[PDB]
């Protein structure tokens, strides 16, 4: 988030950073009972064992190096959907509108 002329521009610096954000919103922000994606660091072997419904969902992985440790993730998707996130210069955050020059 950057600030100038009283307005605060935000953006997500990476598609993976936007994925983890979408996970938290779908979980806590808006209470939707079927969540379309679930991201967990648990090995998919045991994660499938505890959650039997993840055995039918498409999965792709992506890793991150936090504090020197290679933390890997497993994104499970059950439905082909698309989402949008601000990537450059969007001062009007909270309205779902793409301003001119964004």
């Amino acid at each position: 988030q950057q600030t100038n002329a009283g307005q605060t521009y935000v953006y997500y610096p990476n598609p993976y950073y936007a994925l983890l954000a979408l996970n938290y919103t779908l979980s806590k922000i808006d209470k939707v009972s079927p969540s379309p994606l679930y991201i967990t660091t648990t090995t998919p072997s045991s994660a499938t064992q505890i959650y039997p419904f993840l055995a039918h969902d498409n999965m792709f992985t992506f890793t991150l190096n936090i504090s020197g440790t290679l933390v890997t993730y497993y994104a499970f998707v059950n439905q082909t959907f698309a989402f949008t996130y601000p990537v450059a210069g969007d001062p009007l955050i909270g309205s779902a509108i793409a301003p001119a020059g964004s």
Binding site: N4, A5, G6, G89, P91, L92, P99, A100, G101
Partner: protein, 50 residues
């Protein structure tokens, strides 16, 4: 040709119209009014032509 100048006060002069839409309207007693609506990206030069 007639000149028009809008001076800002303390109430509004504390805001900068960046990435916003401005609209001004001049409506005389008899005759059609003139509306001017522009979009400002970023002020530059200390006299921005927009």
């Amino acid at each position: 040709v007639i000149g028009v100048m809008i001076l800002f006060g303390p109430d509004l002069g504390s805001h900068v119209f960046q990435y916003q839409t401005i609209t001004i309207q001049i409506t005389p007693n008899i005759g059609s009014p003139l509306t001017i609506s522009e979009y400002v990206y970023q002020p530059e030069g200390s006299v921005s032509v927009i």
